[PDB]
Structure 1
């Protein structure tokens, strides 16, 4: 599976039949249809004690990994029940500034999209969590092109070392707090993993407020390779999945 003509999202259902399931992600967030839900509590992000370990190129994106052996970086509150630990964060971006985001707002597409992956500690590990309806919590953040993002530069400066599939680099002391918008206003709905195996185990939390990154920041992303070292170069671009059918589900707003 990949993001090309022959192995793109339109092909994933052949190996992962859930691809045409009832709670697939991403989706288009229709802001006039979204329901303001007064019973929605504020989001609770505790990342001051976060421990990053490494960054890797898995062939479809780059993952910044965190030590999830203790409740060091967690998300709670909002529409969530219990504590969710931060495991990794990654992005989805386009070939141009005009596309890249997975989720869309009133059909508007952003340059990229930041996903912070968290798992429900009631289930013991990530592996067990992907087997549950409430096993994951993904915090989605939109990126627009404008001014540079100080907090993202450390990520950008190490991409050169993990250019090809399989590469990894020690990456400690990185604070995720540098990637959050000022407002924590969000939209929430029940969905799924955006990549195979596309398990319908996610509680999506998409922030209203996007973060801005400079054109040169985003440019560095576009220089990665899908392919492994010593293979024809396939730039890592357009690694985003098209919006899926809402199918009855309801998107609620904390605002």
Structure 2
């Protein structure tokens, strides 16, 4: 009886195995745009993905992860609210059963169709596993998806999903350029939080871009054909793999822009 997104093992149950679920810096949160304060001391984000080397795509039973070779200092996030350099390890999405829901963060309670997370680890901790044990170990860049025009840079991801339908399937996925998933603007909100799935570790500086990307209805429909289950198990569509907004508690959301 492992965690997931259903009635019996979903977000409202997670605290039993992972008590930090009710902790002081849980994610996601609602971003109240009027209360978020402009912080003129924040720097522009530096997203340097020119040398990013993707390796593989994996259905892990909750989402699909596009994994990167992080053995060298290549694809890095720095600047913004961050001290030091954070290395890209994977990206993944959260999405809905319908276009009206799917994002984890919300903006004045608005839910987007999906949300992309580019996960990076602080190089001062040497590797990913050690970084998640630290309060500044990860930086996750969050990008909202709305349904409209297709995102051409997403289609290579969409087309490989047929080959990783079920939990535990992976496929080679080289030479994928994550710069094709970014909006024009790097205006962002930032706050201290957590992983949004178990083990819910409070190790993340969240950087959430204001500008959504547009993807087509057909692109997101293909996300919804994936399966939570393994091959030869009852088919459970991989939809609504988002955690709802959590209490903000004693935190401030800062804006990079006026």
TM-score, structure 2 as length reference = 0.99
Deviations 1:214-255 (A, max 9, x none): 000000000000000000100000000000000020000001
Deviations 1:202-225 (A, max 9, x none): 000000000000000000000000
Residue 37 of structure 1: aligned partner: 39
Deviations 1:160-190 (A, max 9, x none): 0000000000000000000000000000000
Deviations 1:4-60 (A, max 9, x none): 000000000000000000000000000000010000000001100000000010000
Structure 1 CA distance for aligned equivalents of residues 150 and 116 of structure 2: 16
Match of 1:197 among 193, 196, 199: 199
Which ranges of structure 2 fall in alignment gaps of 5 or more residues? none
Residue 98 of structure 2: aligned partner: 96
Deviations 1:55-84 (A, max 9, x none): 010000000000001111000000000000
Map 1:52-63; keep pairs closer than 5 Å: 52-63=54-65
Deviations 1:61-119 (A, max 9, x none): 00000000111100000000000000000000000000000000000000000000000
State how many pairs are aligned: 255
Which ranges of structure 1 fall in alignment gaps of 5 or more residues? none
Alignment RMSD (CA, Å)? 0.3
Structure 2 CA distance for aligned equivalents of residues 4 and 71 of structure 1: 39
SS of 1:128's partner is: helix
Structure 2 CA distance for aligned equivalents of residues 119 and 76 of structure 1: 11
Map 1:117-196; keep pairs closer than 5 Å: 117-196=119-198
